[PDB]
């Protein structure tokens, strides 16, 4: 089929900037799970 586009909200226990951060420069410590909160 299609593509299914899906805009999902995200948040963290923690620090959520330092943590998006961190996994987008692929940093080892620092990243956490992410909780898709709505979409």
């Given at each position: 089929?299609?593509?299914?586009?899906?805009?999902?909200l995200?948040?963290?226990?923690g620090?959520?900037?330092?943590?998006?951060?961190?996994l987008?420069?692929?940093?080892?410590?620092?990243?956490?799970?992410?909780?898709?909160?709505?979409?």
């Amino acid at each position: 089929g299609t593509p299914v586009e899906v805009t999902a909200l995200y948040a963290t226990d923690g620090c959520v900037i330092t943590s998006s951060i961190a996994l987008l420069t692929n940093s080892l410590l620092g990243a956490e799970p992410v909780y898709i909160f709505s979409y």
